[PDB]
């Protein structure tokens, strides 16, 4: 239509519908004015996000020790990059959309207009496609950005899409064409669910306190962002060798008999038999007899002697294999040398020698969870309990410098290493040298066979375990902390002086401690934080400073002379150091509220001057104009970070808070005001329904492409191969162009 309703601030240009060239002049003036207000909104929203960054950051005082007497003192601010902080920054960059929706609803006598909801759905489309494509492209070539936390991405993206799905539901499914008080109230109340989820994900889903910390220089004067990172000649018959060697767990040992010399075209018979030496038949090896036959043309025959495995430690033992009774069927063959083989069995049932890798280790305070390996050396037989504890040294740690931990490591059978996790508290110190200790106690063999329990003379209580080892049931010792049935437990409980020696060798194989039983852990300062502080101190009354920075290379001159009026006007905003950033917070959110009051007029009167509908001019112009802070915040988080969690998370949180507060608050106020008068609040669903369903269909395609770029050929969400990078960016921009063009046609009833 060509008739313009009066705005909140701007009056109607008169007369209406003057001519054709006058429409061109009026639309040109409104368009230039609206672009200039978009530049003003971008600058003031950048300052508003800087104030929010100031509020949610902890202030630290940095002492810089120097070799000379004078030591400089600095004050810095650390901003944690958490989900609860990123959703507040996304709320800060979503202030123009939220304020435009609320101001247009309240200013025009609580009547639903196309402008607010339409620029919010267009903001969803622009954020979801154009900003994500640009963040895909900006990442440097050869570098990849991957979402480490994929569950959080799934939940947040599903919630952000469900926001616009529920916008469809309240307008078309439940009482179509009418927004009730409960519908708008629940739409508003979904936002605290988002905030509580951000807090819970920070506490439990991420374990942010215990991730590796990286620090980067901020955009403000003293701000430092701390984020998650990756934590760094007749024939004769004789033995081939004459002495064979085997382990105890080999099962069988191979002995090679050779017939050599004489004539091969004959049959030879020779007997073999084992004899006990230090090792006894039936306990250490299988007693075997036999006769081997040498065929004509045959020279060597392999015989196999069984070795009995067990659980008891023993010394190196030996037994003898003899050959005898050389015969020839149908002298020609004799018993050669060596006629006797000595087979030696090495035991491997030592329960272990437990030690630390090094006596002293150096860790940074940003390590988060530190892992100390405890090694098991020279045997890994049985399950053993090794107590461990932390000892306070210079690092007085009860949550101050570290978290006290103590307990027991259980090494299973044939397990040769275990880890101890110690929680290191990060304090952001420029210079730190603290010391604590980690000690391990006497190991105890808690799980063994029954015969080993006889040989070790264990007098405790054993509960039979379902496991079977070397063909024997496995028994486990009962601890005092455990309360069993007391019918389940079994007490296993003049020696011939040979069995006494067997017990002594059995006790020689019990678990003991190694070289390093105490670890001295030295907590030191972060190199990344120290280098970032050095970068700050290399390059770093404030009321005067803002005005001096306001007015100060041809492209820089063009941008400076374009934005000098806005910078001079916004230099009257209080600096962020006042009121812990709240002084800048109160004024800027006022100023944004002013500049989205004019835009809501300028976007409206531009539409009716040339006959453009409010929905189309909100989708293509207002949505692109109010998402610029989201564009730069997502680009910075895509470039400077190591993961893609923050860049996509800003888009997703912005899409959620655009609905839950931008539409929720405005339609709650309108529904309550109309319900006070006993009348319904009527919203036309036809314009918004096609836009929100088109957004859902394109958003599922976007999420599918984002998940498909996780393959190792591409490697991650952002960046990656250049040829796939270009295709992904062009695909997403094409999705945005198709969305805005289809919605533009559909607004004019073309369907």
């Amino acid at each position, epitope marked *: 239509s060509y008739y313009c309703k009066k705005g909140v601030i701007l009056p109607i240009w008169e007369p209406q519908d003057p001519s054709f060239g006058d429409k061109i002049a009026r639309a040109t003036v409104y368009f230039v004015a609206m672009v200039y207000m978009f530049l003003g909104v971008s600058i003031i929203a950048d300052r508003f996000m800087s104030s929010i960054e100031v509020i949610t950051s902890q202030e630290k005082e940095i002492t810089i020790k120097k070799p000379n007497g004078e030591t400089t003192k600095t004050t810095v601010r650390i901003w944690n990059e958490t989900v609860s902080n990123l959703t507040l920054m996304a709320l800060g960059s979503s202030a123009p959309e939220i304020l435009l929706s609320v101001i247009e609803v309240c200013g025009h006598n609580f009547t639903a207009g196309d402008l607010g909801p339409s620029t919010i759905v267009g903001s969803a489309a622009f954020n979801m496609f154009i900003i994500i494509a640009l963040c895909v492209y900006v990442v440097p070539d050869g570098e990849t950005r991957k979402i480490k936390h994929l569950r959080v991405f799934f939940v947040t993206a599903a919630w952000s899409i469900f926001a616009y799905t529920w916008l469809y539901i309240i307008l078309s499914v439940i009482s179509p064409g009418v927004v009730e008080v409960w519908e708008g109230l629940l739409t508003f109340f979904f936002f605290p669910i988002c905030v509580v989820f951000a807090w819970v994900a920070d506490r439990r889903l991420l374990f942010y306190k215990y991730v590796y910390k990286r620090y980067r220089a901020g955009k403000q004067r003293g701000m430092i962002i701390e984020h998650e990172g990756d934590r760094p000649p007749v024939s004769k018959i004789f033995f081939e060798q004459g002495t064979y060697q085997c382990l105890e767990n080999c099962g069988t040992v191979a002995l090679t008999i050779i017939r050599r010399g004489g004539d091969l075209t004959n049959t030879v018979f020779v007997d073999f038999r084992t004899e006990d030496g230090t090792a006894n038949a039936g306990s250490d090896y299988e007693f075997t007899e036999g006769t081997v036959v040498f065929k004509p043309g045959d020279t060597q025959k392999e015989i196999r002697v069984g070795i009995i495995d067990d659980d008891i430690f023993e010394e190196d033992e030996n037994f003898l294999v003899h050959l005898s009774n050389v015969k020839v069927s149908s002298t020609l063959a004799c018993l050669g040398s060596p006629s006797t083989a000595t087979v030696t069995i090495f035991d491997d049932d030592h329960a272990g020698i437990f030690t630390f890798e090094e006596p002293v280790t150096h860790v940074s305070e940003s390590i988060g969870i530190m892992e100390v390996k405890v090694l098991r050396t020279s045997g890994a037989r049985g399950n053993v309990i090794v*107590p461990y504890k932390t000892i306070e040294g210079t690092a007085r740690g009860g949550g101050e410098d570290f978290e006290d931990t103590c307990g027991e490591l259980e090494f299973q059978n044939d397990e040769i290493v275990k880890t101890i996790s110690v929680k290191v508290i990060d304090d952001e110190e420029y210079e730190k040298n603290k010391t604590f200790f980690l*000690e391990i106690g006497e190991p*105890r063999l808690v799980e063994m066979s029954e015969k080993k329990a006889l040989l070790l*003379n*264990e007098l405790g209580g054993f509960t039979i375990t379902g496991k079977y080892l070397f063909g024997q049931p496995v028994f486990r*010792k009962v601890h*005092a902390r455990e309360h069993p049935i007391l019918s389940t437990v079994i007490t296993i409980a003049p020696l011939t002086s040979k069995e006494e020696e067997e017990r002594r060798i059995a006790e020689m194989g019990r678990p*003991i401690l190694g*070289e390093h039983t105490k670890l001295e852990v030295i907590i030191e300062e972060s190199y990344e934080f120290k280098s970032t502080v050095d970068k700050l101190i290399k390059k770093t009354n404030s009321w005067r400073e803002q005005f001096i920075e306001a007015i100060t290379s041809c492209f820089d001159y063009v941008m400076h002379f374009l934005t000098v009026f806005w910078k001079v006007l916004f230099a009257f905003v209080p600096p962020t150091e006042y009121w812990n950033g709240w002084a800048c917070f109160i004024v800027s959110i006022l100023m944004i509220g002013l500049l989205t009051a004019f835009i809501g007029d300028l976007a409206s009167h531009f539409g009716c001057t040339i006959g453009l509908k409010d929905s189309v001019t909100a989708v293509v112009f207002v949505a692109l104009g109010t998402s610029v802070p989201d564009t730069f915040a997502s680009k910075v988080a895509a470039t400077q970070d190591q993961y893609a969690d923050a860049s996509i998370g800003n888009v997703t949180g912005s899409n959620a808070v655009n609905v839950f507060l931008g539409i929720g608050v405005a339609w709650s106020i309108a529904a309550i005001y109309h319900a006070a008068n006993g009348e319904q609040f009527k919203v036309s669903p036809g314009t918004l329904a096609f836009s929100v369903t088109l957004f859902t269909i394109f958003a599922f395609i976007n999420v599918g492409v984002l998940l498909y770029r996780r393959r190792p050929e591409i490697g991650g969400e952002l960046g990656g191969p250049r040829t796939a990078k270009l295709l992904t960016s062009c695909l997403f921009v094409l999705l945005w162009l198709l969305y805005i063009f289809f919605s533009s046609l559909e607004a004019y009833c073309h369907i």
Partner: antibody
Amino acid sequence: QVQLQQSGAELARPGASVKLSCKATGYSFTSYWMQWVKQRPGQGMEWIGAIYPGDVTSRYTQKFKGKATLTADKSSSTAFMQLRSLASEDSAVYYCARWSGYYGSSSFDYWGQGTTLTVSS
Amino acid sequence: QAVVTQESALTTSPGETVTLTCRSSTGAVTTSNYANWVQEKPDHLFTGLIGGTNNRVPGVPARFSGSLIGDKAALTITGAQTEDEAIYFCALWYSNHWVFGGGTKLTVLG
């Protein structure tokens, strides 16, 4: 307030067997080791062994492996040390000592008052 | 099988500094021997003073310290009191047993 209280003076005939008690109070009995130590006049001190009552794990010297038996009664928080086949060398004073299980700490933290055992006829 | 050797007796005055020696037969006392120093007061009162060759039991007065000097463990008492008159034993941890020293009869004049 850790206290280890032992039994009184005891006399036994040669070739007999004796059981000696050491009741521990003021700390968790089952999570700590108990050292048993022998003292004779003019021969210094000899370490008989150690016991962990939580699992009833045992350590002994080779000389006292068959001579002494280490048992525990965790219901009454008591450790027992039993000597068999007594001889004239066995007339001594026996002590029990608390050990936390770690070698960096002291292995003989709190001692009992000592039990005097005399083997004569 | 090792034999730990100490001096027979040591004689000092109150306020002085005294050093007590723990020698191992097999060689040099190391940090893997975990030298314990314990104290016997008259009438069979035993107290554990220092363990792990450095660590001091809580409640022990601060004048007691343990260290390694040369190839032997050492107990240093700085400003010995008249109440420190006792018999001091040193226990060394070998591979599977503890060996106790002879015991120094430390006496303080009064």
